[PDB]
Design a binder for this molecule. Structure first.
Ligand SMILES: [Zn+2]
Ligand SMILES: [Zn+2]
Ligand SMILES: [Zn+2]
Lengths: 98, 86, 56, 144, 167, 56, 171, 111, 49
């Protein structure tokens, strides 16, 4: 539920885009879901089929580029967490400060 | 109606002010944009504001400006009789 | 007809009843027939008056 | 057993139920996906406090402390008055147990989740008939 | 004009002749002159409404038993009235089937009859709208009349009203 | 007055004194979101029936 | 009860009617917006008297709307109900809860608790009716109802009546 | 979409009158009485009746209606509750004014 | 983008009363409330339906 209007095509089975793939605005980079307590209906559209809610991290709306790297590891508490880096090229234009 | 000064004792300027002209043109432009009967012949004009300017030039705007006074009294001045010199 | 993805174009159409139609997702029903008294929210064009400001 | 007070957004024109609804967050609109009719506009996206619904249930409290200007006499009496609350006393016991659980877990160099689970486990299994004749030390250790 | 906050207002009750803050005995017309409350019985109301409708019909074009009369009012009402006339249509139908005095002559006499009592305009309208056979019936149907007109005058007034009405 | 400084203190004093605000200045109308009596708002635009008949 | 009342209204005209014959449009709007309307203050406004002499004041153009607001003074006949009033009407409909009469432009509801004990509801008869030893109450029957209460909303009026008192009920 | 049509007349504010709430007015204005210091029931599913977030007071959730006016979040203006204090308390902003008045009038006969 | 107090002053100097209302109402928060004629409080329960 509450899935973002962006596109999840570039994500893999683990919810992470592999390095080297091109990304644009609204594209989900990190796919995450959390269980939802039953007995909560919003805008209708909530049937017995739905059991999760989207908690993904999309790319910045005004930024686009290519995923540089994706590292997966655990924090001090042992919980899974990941870092994703994106490359983009900036070319001088009108309005750039020098 | 003690707050309506008779036409014979009006003491305000006989000249339209910039704010009065701006609101009259905008007021009539909105009416034109909402399909109001245009009283001036059009030689080809689609912008409501330009039509209102044509009406003001030929004095075909059927509106009266109620100029208020600091004590609450008011004077009614027709657009046709107001001099547009600015 | 141009739509919100081609300047000059439009983004919304508002009927006299207050209903607003987003031109995106509205092309599925083909063209829309405008009527007098409706409002079309269209991209700002040349010669349009805008207020230009600099702070403080 | 209570009033519905539930609103379902459906397109009056399309009439298809359930409807295809797209939330234009950037535009702040809820629009029908088939015809484009807008069903709701002016959508909404420190002036608050961090609250945990599970381990603390519904318990709201505020502390009394010194400011830029303050006389020590007023602070002491107010704190004394706050402590002598019959209703807040019952929840303080659970909080006191949580504090001791936190101390034990912290001294064990255990992760935060382990401390959270121990506190939650105590709350769920506390105030029960079966566990009344058992020492609190055993209760805390079992939860940890 | 300054103390706008809530004040204890008398309840709207007909028995006490407390018609409210807007239906007081003294009324001011648009010009500003003081006028009395205009209360119309069923017969008077039918004539006033019809007199306006007939005049209304004349303005546009220029620039009997109950059954046939009901049809005559029906055709006139539609022609001389606009849309959303549901309430008016029922009103005219109700007035014809419940009015007691048909023409102006009988209606005029009724007004010429009951104004000598000096009662409230609401009370006199009630007397001309409800048909009462005995003083007790009028007293109970119109409690305000109590302690205002003696049974001697009331008995003769009702008797004359019944003898001034024919169908 | 509250728009400048001592917002809360002034408002409390008005409540105790039961002050009446006539909403003449820009600050009152700006707070209430209505056209202030300034510039174009210093007058009323009415419709002249005597002139409508004579423009046709 | 019927009264001749002096009333005022604020009418808004779209600019499309800002023509040489705008006064006629205002008169038409008054009939289409006042006649047949219900107001809790003045009651049901039935007919407008002196249609040819309606006082139309100067119109003020709304700042944002662009429409002209006109203060219209007119004389009209209004039916205003009152508590404690006695009226006659026709039973439009009947049901288990009660039967309601049709008095002019208003409908008065008669509840079972406001009815005499002898009268009882009978759903076996078509149409349903309240039957008693002395009389039977059915649709289209004539009833003398006393209004025991009135609730007046800004655009709606509802009343409840009783026939327990003497000289009431079937006429 | 915009707000729903209303039959009430539309006017412009002409005057603002300040003042103080009487204890009677607060009770009359209030739509519900708050007696529980909690916000949600034991299930943390719906707001507790009589609590701080009583449904009768209004709604701030886009999916819930107001139990009073049965209107959406964008239409409900909010409804006021009231708490009956056990003992009277001073208004922090009027303590200075109260002190001045107390000196002005007698503390026994109030003259 | 903030239309601050200083911006409001300039429009006041310009005399654009209608524009100032448009920025503060149509281009920003706009709300309709019901008030009682006896008491000027927004405590009217309106059943619009
Ligand atoms: Zn649709
Ligand atoms: Zn509400
Ligand atoms: Zn009030």
């Amino acid at each position: 539920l509450r899935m973002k209007h962006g596109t999840y095509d570039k994500l893999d089975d683990d919810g992470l885009i592999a390095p080297g793939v091109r990304v644009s605005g609204e594209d989900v980079i990190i796919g995450k879901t959390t269980p939802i307590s039953p007995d909560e209906e919003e805008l209708g559209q909530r049937t017995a089929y739905h059991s999760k809610r989207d908690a993904s991290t999309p790319l910045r709306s005004t930024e686009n580029g290519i995923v540089d790297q994706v590292l997966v590891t655990t924090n001090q508490d042992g919980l899974k967490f990941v870092k994703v880096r994106v490359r983009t090229t900036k070319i001088p234009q009108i309005g750039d400060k020098f | 109606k003690e707050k309506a000064i008779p036409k014979d004792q009006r003491a305000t300027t006989p000249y339209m002010t910039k704010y009065e002209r701006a609101r009259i043109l905008g007021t009539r432009a909105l009416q034109i944009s909402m399909n109001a009967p245009v009283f001036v012949d059009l030689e080809g004009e689609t912008d409501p504001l330009r039509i209102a300017m044509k009406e003001l030039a030929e004095k075909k705007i059927p509106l009266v400006i109620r100029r208020y006074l600091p004590d609450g009294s008011f004077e009614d001045w027709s657009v046709e009789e107001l001099i547009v010199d600015l | 007809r141009n739509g919100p993805n081609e300047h000059p174009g439009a983004k919304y159409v508002i009927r006299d009843s207050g209903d607003r139609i987003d031109l995106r997702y509205s092309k599925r029903a083909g063209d829309i027939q405008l009527q007098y008294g409706w409002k079309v929210e269209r991209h700002i064009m040349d010669n349009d008056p805008v207020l230009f400001n600099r702070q403080p | 057993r209570g009033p519905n007070l539930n609103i379902v957004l459906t397109c009056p024109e399309c009439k298809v139920y359930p409807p295809k609804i797209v939330e234009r967050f950037s535009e702040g609109d809820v629009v029908c996906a088939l015809c484009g009719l807008v069903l709701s506009d002016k959508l909404v996206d420190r002036v608050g406090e961090a609250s945990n619904p599970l381990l603390d249930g519904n318990n709201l409290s505020t502390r009394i402390g010194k400011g830029e200007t303050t006389d020590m006499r007023f602070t002491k009496e107010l704190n004394k008055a706050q402590g002598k609350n019959v209703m807040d006393k019952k929840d303080n016991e659970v909080q006191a147990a949580f504090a001791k659980i936190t101390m034990l877990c912290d001294a064990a160099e255990l992760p935060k989740i382990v401390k959270d689970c121990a506190k939650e486990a105590y709350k769920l299994c506390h105030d029960e008939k079966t566990l009344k004749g058992k020492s609190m030390e055993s209760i805390m250790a079992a939860s940890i | 004009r300054r103390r706008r906050l809530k004040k204890v207002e008398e309840e709207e009750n007909a028995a006490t002749l407390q018609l409210g803050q807007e239906f007081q005995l003294k009324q001011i017309n648009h010009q500003g002159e003081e006028e009395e409350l205009i209360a119309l019985n069923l017969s008077e109301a039918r004539l006033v409404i019809k007199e306006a409708l007939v005049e209304r019909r004349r303005a546009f074009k220029r620039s009997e038993t109950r059954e046939k009369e009901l049809e005559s009012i029906d055709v006139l009402l539609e022609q001389t009235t606009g849309g959303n006339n549901k309430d008016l249509k029922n009103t005219m139908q109700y007035l014809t089937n419940f009015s007691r005095f048909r023409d102006q002559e009988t209606v005029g006499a009724v007004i010429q009859l009951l104004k000598s009592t000096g009662l409230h305009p609401f009370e006199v309208a009630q007397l001309g709208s409800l048909a009462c056979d005995t003083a007790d019936e009028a007293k109970t149907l119109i409690p305000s009349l109590n302690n205002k007109i003696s049974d001697d005058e009331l008995e003769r007034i009702l008797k004359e009203l019944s003898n001034l009405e024919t169908l | 007055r509250c728009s400048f400084e001592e917002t809360v203190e002034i408002l409390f004093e008005a409540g105790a004194s039961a002050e009446l605000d006539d909403c003449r200045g820009v600050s009152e109308n700006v707070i209430l979101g209505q056209m202030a009596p300034i510039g174009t708002g210093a007058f009323d635009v009415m419709i002249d029936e005597e002139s409508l008949v004579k423009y046709m | 009860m019927f009264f001749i009342k002096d009333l005022s209204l604020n009418i808004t005209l779209h600019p499309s009617f800002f023509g040489p014959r705008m006064k006629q449009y205002l008169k038409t709007k008054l009939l289409e917006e006042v006649e047949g309307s219900c107001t809790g203050k003045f009651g049901y406004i039935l007919c407008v008297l002196d249609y040819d002499n309606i006082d139309i004041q100067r119109g003020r153009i709304l700042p944002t709307d662009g429409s002209a607001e006109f203060n219209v003074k007119y004389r009209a006949v209004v039916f205003k109900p009152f508590k404690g009033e006695v009226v006659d009407g026709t039973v439009v409909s009947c049901s288990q809860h009660g039967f309601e009469v049709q008095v002019g432009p208003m409908k008065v509801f008669v509840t079972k608790h406001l009815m005499p004990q002898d009268l009882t509801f009978n759903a076996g008869s078509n149409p349903p009716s309240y039957q008693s030893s002395e009389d039977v109450i059915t649709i289209k029957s004539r009833i003398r109802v006393k209004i025991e209460g009135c609730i007046s909303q800004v655009s709606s009026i509802h009343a409840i009546g009783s026939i327990k008192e003497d000289y009431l009920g079937a006429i | 979409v915009g707000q729903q049509y209303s039959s009430a007349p539309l006017r412009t504010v002409k005057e603002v009158q300040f003042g103080l709430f009487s204890p009677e007015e607060v009770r009359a204005i209030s739509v519900a009485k708050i007696r529980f210091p909690e916000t949600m029931d034991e299930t943390q599913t719906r707001a507790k009746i009589g609590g701080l977030n009583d449904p009768r007071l209004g709604s701030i959730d886009r999916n819930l209606k107001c139990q009073t006016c049965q209107e959406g979040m964008n239409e409900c203006p909010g409804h006021f509750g009231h708490i009956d204090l056990a003992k009277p308390v001073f208004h922090v902003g009027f303590i200075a004014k109260i002190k001045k008045v107390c000196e002005c009038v007698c503390m026994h006969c109030g003259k | 983008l903030r239309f601050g107090e200083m911006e409001r002053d300039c429009m006041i100097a310009h005399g654009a009363a209608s524009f100032l209302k448009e920025r503060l109402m149509e281009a920003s928060d706009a709300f309709r409330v019901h008030i009682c004629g006896i008491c000027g409080l927004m405590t009217v329960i309106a059943k619009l339906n």
